[PDB]
Each structure stands twice: as C-alpha cells, then as structure tokens.
C-alpha cells in the first residue's frame, strides 16, 4: 500500500484524487490533508477518511475545523500555517505528495516533499513555472520522482519511452527518437466567440468549460489560454524540451489530451473523458494501473476531432508566456506572478476578462529584476511583481 | 548493423521496408530479396541494394532475373523456389526478416525465420492467422521475437506496457492493466456506397483506397472488412486478448491506426499518416527510433478524425471471420483459404465483389475436417478449401 499526504485536497484535483483512494480503498491510505480556508469540504474529508493529520492555511479555518471534528470524536488532529504543511509533505510514512494547491503558494510544502525525497503527483503547475531549473535541480539532487499530474503532461508522459519516464527533465529527446512534444488544445469556452465580444464576457462565463469542471483560476487561463502558456513553459522543464521541440495545438474537444512526435513518423497520444481522475490515478498506480471511477471511452458517441493553429490576437496571454521563456526566469516568475493577480481581479469583479493580457503585459515591462539564483530570490521577484500587478489592477478598477 | 532477409521485397510493403533501408544505409544492409514473378522490380531492387542472393518464387522467372544481373556484372546469385526462400529467411548474417508474403504461402519461409531464432518484422497476417496457435508456439520455442509491421498491430504495439512487448502473445492484459485492445478502422472505399450499389463494384474501383497504396489482395480485403476480420483474429493471438478484450471500430480518415484502454480511463493510441514505412521502421529500429522518410503529420491540414460502430450487412466478411474464430482452428484455416481464393476470383473478374461473402460462407459449410495438430495439417486444411473454394467460384461463373 502506498500512503498519501494531499496539499490542497479541497480544490478540484484534491476531490479528484480523493476519490481515485475512495474506488482503491487496498492500495490507498491518506495519512494528511492540506487546505486554506474550506471548512466544510475538509470536515466532509476528514470524517470521511480519518486521516492522521488536517491542515488549514488560514488559523481560524483551522479552529473551526477542530471543533467539528473533536465533536464527532474524529481521530484527526488540525494544525494550520505553511511550515505545516510542509512537515505534513515530509511525514516518513508518506510515499507520495499530490501536488495541487493553486498558484506558487503551493511552491514551498512542494519542495519540501521533494527534499524528503517523496514522490510527487505534480499538478501544481505554478510551482514549477516560477521555480524553473532551481525546481529541477531540487528534485536532481534528492532521491525524488516527479509523475506529471496535469493532463497534459501526463498524456505526454504516458507517450513517452521508459528511458525519459525514469530520467523525466535530464534525458535527451532527440536520442530516444522524439522530435516533438504536442501540446493541446481545448481553446477554453470563448474558441469561437468573434473577437470584439471577449471584453465582455464575465467570470461565470469563464469559468464554465464544456469539457472540464475545474477550479476558477484554472478556468480563466483556459479562457485566455494563459494556462497553455503556462503548461508550455512547465512542459520544457519536465521533458528537456527546446523551443524547436515544442508545438502547440488547439484541440476543441478535449479527448486527446497531448501527443508526442517521433522520428519514424509516428505520433503517440493518451484519449479518454475529459476527467481528472484518469491521469491522477495513473501516477498514484504508476506504472501499475487501478480503476479510478472514470467510464470507458465510447468513441462512437464523440464529436468529430479537429486541430487547429493558436491566433495570437485571440490569445494575447500565449505569446506573453512563450516569449517571457526567452526572456529568462525573472520575467516568466514576474508573469505567473502577475497572472495569479489579475486572474483574481477579473474573478472578482475589478476588471474586464481582457485586461488580464494587457495588465499581464504591462506588469512585464515595469519589472526590472536579476536572474533568481535561489529559491528566496524567485519569492522575492513573485512578491515584488504582485506588488506591481496590484497597482496596475487598481488603474483600471471602478 | 542489422541485416534483413525480405520475404515478397517486390510488394507494397517489401518496397516500403526497402524506402526505409534505402533512407538508413549506416542502419540497415538487404543481404536477401525473396519475391513471386514481378522481375522488373526484382532486378531494380538488386541492382540497387547489391544482396547477396535472390529468390523468385517461378522458375522462369529466375531465369530472366539471373540474364539481367550477370549482363550488368552484379554479384547477387539467384534461386529459386520455396526451399530457397526458407534458407534465405535462416542465414547465420541474417538478424531481420521482413515476412511480408501475402496470404499463407508466406508460412513456410516465415516459420523457418522463426526456426532460425530471427526477428520476424510480421507482416503477412494470413500466416498467423491460419496456424494461430501453432505459430505461437515455434516463436515461444525458439529464440524468436515477434515485432508486428501491420498498421493495427504495430500502433497496439507501440501502446503497450513493455512486459506485453517483451513477451508478446504470453503476458496477460489484465494483470498490465489492460482492458481491451481498440482495433481500427478505414472501412474500405465503399463505405459510403449505398448498400444495393455494392454489387456493381468493379475491382479498379476496390483497390482505390482514399488513404492507403497497398497491393491488390489486401485492397479488396479492407473493402469487404474482411481485413479487420483477419486482424482480428492476428490480435487475439499476438496479444493474448480474448473476444470481451477485443473492439472493432471504423475510422474513416485511417490517421488514427489503432489503440489500447486502460483501467484507469486512459487510452493510448498510434497516429499518422497513412504510411507504411512508419510501422515497419518501427520495428526495424526498435527500440530505437529511425527516419523512414514520412514527414510529420500536420494535424492543421487534417479531415474531423469521426468513429462509428461496424456493420455486419455492410461488411458480411467481418461477422464470418470473427465467428470463424469460435469456431476454431479447421474454419479459420478454411476461410482464411477461401477469402484468398474469392478475393483472386473478383480481381480476374469471374465474380461480383459481394460473391466474395457469399461463396465464403459457402466454403465454410461443406468444409468438414478435424482442428489441426501441426503445421502439415494446416496446410491440408488449406489446400482442401482451396479445393471447395474453386468449385464455388466456378458456379457462379460466365
Ligand atoms: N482542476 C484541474 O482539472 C487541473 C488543475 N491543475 C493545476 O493544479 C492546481 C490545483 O488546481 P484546482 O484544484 O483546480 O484549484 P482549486 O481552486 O479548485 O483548489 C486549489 C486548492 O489549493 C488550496 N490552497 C490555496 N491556497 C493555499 C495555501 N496557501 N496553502 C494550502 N492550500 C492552499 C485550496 O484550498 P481551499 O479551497 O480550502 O481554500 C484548494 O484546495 C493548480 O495549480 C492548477 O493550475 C492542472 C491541471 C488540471
Ligand atoms: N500493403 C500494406 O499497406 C499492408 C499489407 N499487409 C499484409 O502484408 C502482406 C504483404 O502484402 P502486399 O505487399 O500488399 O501484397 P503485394 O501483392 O503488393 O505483394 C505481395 C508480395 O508477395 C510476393 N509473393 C507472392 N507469392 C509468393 C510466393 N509464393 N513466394 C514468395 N513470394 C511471394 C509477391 O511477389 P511478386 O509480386 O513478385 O509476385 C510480392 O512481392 C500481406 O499478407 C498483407 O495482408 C498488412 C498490412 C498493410
Ligand atoms: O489538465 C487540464 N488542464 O490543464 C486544463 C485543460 C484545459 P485547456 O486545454 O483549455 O488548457
Ligand atoms: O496496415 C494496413 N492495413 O492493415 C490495411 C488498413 C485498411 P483497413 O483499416 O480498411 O483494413
């Protein structure tokens, strides 16, 4: 049996996870949960799978989730604050670490998993965008396993030979015979609305995907195809990838999930329902398999398959994370950093859904920063760049 | 360095597996060319790969290709005959054998292949298909590895775990967490001919596939699904599936080549062009990856990729050999034996493209012999209903 600490179990991945434990009860124990503030789902959790320990992010979350649970006569014990969490994703039982809080908040109980050598179902894509080689490095030097958890990247792990799968990061592409990584594709629920009508298009618009039922933040960079941007950065770090070994696809209905090219012609890919519980289940049983509650494909009740080439003037977002690569890792933190804000505008209210882009680009240009050289130095361009984002949010707010 | 016997090099397939050669020179060396009676491609074949030897199956055939050759001062000695072929096929220098005769008069040589200890590049299906699991076990017994070049088996191939791949045929499904082997899927070009128009379908107009350049045999065969029919049963043996562990699918667009479900949802698949150089430098490199001089897919010029569920009064050939596999080894050997016959019968124009269904299931019924105990008995299974097809073919003739 394997024995699981899960950061941001509350969230749309946590739930999804829990629930591949929940249909493998034999292989799958929680030892710890790791949240922020949503008590009711992490009391729904707790009683549920009576794991050891219950972190809340925020104290008083924490406080009401203990006088729940010592009322029930629930043997799990709640402690709150990061370092918490970040004990919690170091337990010597825990085998592995989902991964999944939003944003690089979940970046430093991630590294310390990595640092006590856990293997880790990798979904928290900010992470690793804003941490860059230094993440890489991190995961080099302990004994630890990196088992992509995003749909993506886990479509594109799954095609790979055994030779990257064991070596993820510091194999070479070009001599196990892969050219190409291709990257999909949804185009997020405003693909096919004309251009002038982006602006207003509102957050429950958003964040209402036809494929994928996932948390806001995430939903948003669908729409703006930030989260391709974000995922294509992600992708160069995990697979060893260049720029030249990178593609780009939109893929409307999210049954192909990635792909990866080959010398000989050919092209492996991963289908299945768009559902999170698939690839999640394929890292926590890697290179096993298990049921996880998702249906068996029926091809004959799908939409045709279509691919299309990304419009830049649709998706402003895209180039900005494409080229902030080139720029270096001070812009592309400074541009996660800068997106967590303005996508956290637009949800609530103080902008419009397209000046997420143009605010993006704007906090871009006003930073002026060196090179992080240490995990501190990537924390202190992410908490200068939100500064920056916050003032240029108010500039367009009502 | 490797080096390649090729059984039926003057084929479509043997032709693309000498592409491959011909794009790999450092990779790849023909030391022998095995074909039938087509001499003008059998003499350019040797003129330019310079092979040690070369068989025509024909005597007379030989005979006109040893004049050419010792006019232009090659070095490459001709036989002739199946004894010649199957001591090409078991030369010590030997360490390849491309076995893409077609139907089963490829058996033979192909099973002296695997007496040898080759690699077997296994194209010819009508093989294995009639001597089923006598052919699994001379590959068990000897030092062989099976490596499948057909489009279908190939794609499964490269979509499976490598404990199937190591011991294919013998390892089991479930226990790698496999849950079915998803087989595809063109449809043939009358797909979409009106059901009462099939009768007046010419063999020009069978042999034009919308996506494939194959020879004539296999042509008529995946008009008829009798191609899907046949691969199927090659699938049941090559990857150990049973009838709930096997699915049969349509793809019209054949980029798409075939695929394999997952427990958890997951489903892997081999895409394309169309193209078979592919699969068959697949094999040629594997577990390495060479060029076979197929570019990559564009996946922005492609038609929408759609499904649908086959139907038995559209391809009547597909519900014979499917059952034919429940029936056993005598029926299978039977049809298979048949299905070469009528197919000749409708390409020389003595019987309608639906005849072919129809005098198959007619062979079937009056064929009344014991299962096969050894390879000698398969071949009087085949010689017999080959006998019975004859006739058949004959009472429908003008
Ligand atoms: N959902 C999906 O289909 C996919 C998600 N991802 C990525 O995976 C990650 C998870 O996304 P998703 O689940 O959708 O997001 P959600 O908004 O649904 O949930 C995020 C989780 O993180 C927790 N969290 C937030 N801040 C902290 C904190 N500082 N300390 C501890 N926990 C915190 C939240 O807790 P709480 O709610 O209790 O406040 C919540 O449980 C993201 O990085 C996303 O980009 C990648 C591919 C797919
Ligand atoms: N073509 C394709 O895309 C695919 C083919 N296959 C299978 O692979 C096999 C090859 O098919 P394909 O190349 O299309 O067929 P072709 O008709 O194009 O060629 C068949 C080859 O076999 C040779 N041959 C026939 N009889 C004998 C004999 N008795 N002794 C030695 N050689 C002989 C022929 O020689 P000659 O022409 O000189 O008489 C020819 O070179 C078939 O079993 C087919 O079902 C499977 C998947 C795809
Ligand atoms: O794992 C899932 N995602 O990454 C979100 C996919 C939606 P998109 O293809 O529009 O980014
Ligand atoms: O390898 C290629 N084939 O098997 C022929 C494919 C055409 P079909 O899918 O119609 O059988």
Not at 193 to 208: E, V
Not at 306 to 314: E, G, I, Q, S, V
Not at 374 to 385: E, Q, T
Request: proline fraction near 5%; include cysteine; aromatic fraction near 6%.
């Amino acid at each position: 049996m394997k024995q699981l600490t899960i950061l941001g179990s509350t969230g749309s991945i946590g739930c999804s996870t829990l629930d591949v434990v929940r249909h493998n009860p034999e292989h799958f124990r929680v030892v710890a949960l790791v949240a922020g503030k949503n008590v009711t789902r992490m009391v729904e959790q707790c009683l549920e799978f009576s794991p050891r320990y219950a972190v809340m992010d925020d104290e008083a979350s924490a406080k009401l989730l203990k006088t729940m649970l010592q009322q029930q006569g629930s043997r799990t014990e709640v402690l709150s604050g990061q370092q918490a969490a970040c004990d919690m994703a170091a337990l010597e039982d825990v085998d592995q670490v989902m991964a999944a809080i939003v944003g690089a908040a979940g970046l430093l109980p991630t590294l310390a998993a990595i640092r006590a050598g856990k293997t880790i179902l990798l979904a928290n894509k900010e992470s690793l965008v804003t941490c860059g080689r230094l993440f890489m490095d991190a995961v080099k030097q302990s004994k630890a396993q990196l088992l992509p958890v995003d749909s993506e990247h886990n479509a594109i792990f799954q095609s790979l030979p055994q030779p990257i799968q064991h070596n993820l990061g510091y194999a070479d592409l070009e001599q196990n015979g892969v050219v190409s990584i291709l990257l999909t594709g949804s185009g997020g629920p405003f693909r096919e609305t004309p251009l002038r009508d982006l602006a207003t298009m509102t957050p429950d618009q958003a964040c209402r995907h036809p494929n994928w039922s996932m948390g806001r933040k995430i939903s948003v960079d669908s729409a703006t195809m930030m989260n391709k941007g974000l995922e294509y950065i992600e992708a160069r770090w995990l697979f060893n990838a260049s720029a030249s070994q990178m593609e780009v696809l939109i893929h409307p209905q999210s049954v192909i999930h990635s792909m990866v090219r080959y010398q000989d012609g050919s092209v492996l890919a991963q289908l299945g329902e768009p559902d999170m519980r698939t690839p999640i289940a394929h890292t926590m049983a890697w290179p096993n398999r298990v049921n996880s509650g998702v249906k068996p494909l029926d091809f004959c009740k799908l939409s045709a398959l279509t691919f299309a080439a990304p419009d830049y003037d649709r998706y402003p977002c895209l180039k900005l994370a494409m080229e902030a690569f080139e720029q270096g890792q001070a812009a592309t933190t400074a541009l996660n950093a800068a997106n967590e804000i303005t996508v956290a505008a637009f949800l609530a209210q103080q902008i419009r859904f397209t000046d997420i882009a143009a605010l993006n680009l704007s906090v871009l240009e006003k930073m002026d920063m060196r090179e992080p050289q240490c995990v501190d130095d990537v924390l202190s361009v992410d908490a200068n760049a939100r500064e920056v984002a916050r003032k240029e949010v108010m500039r367009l707010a009502s």
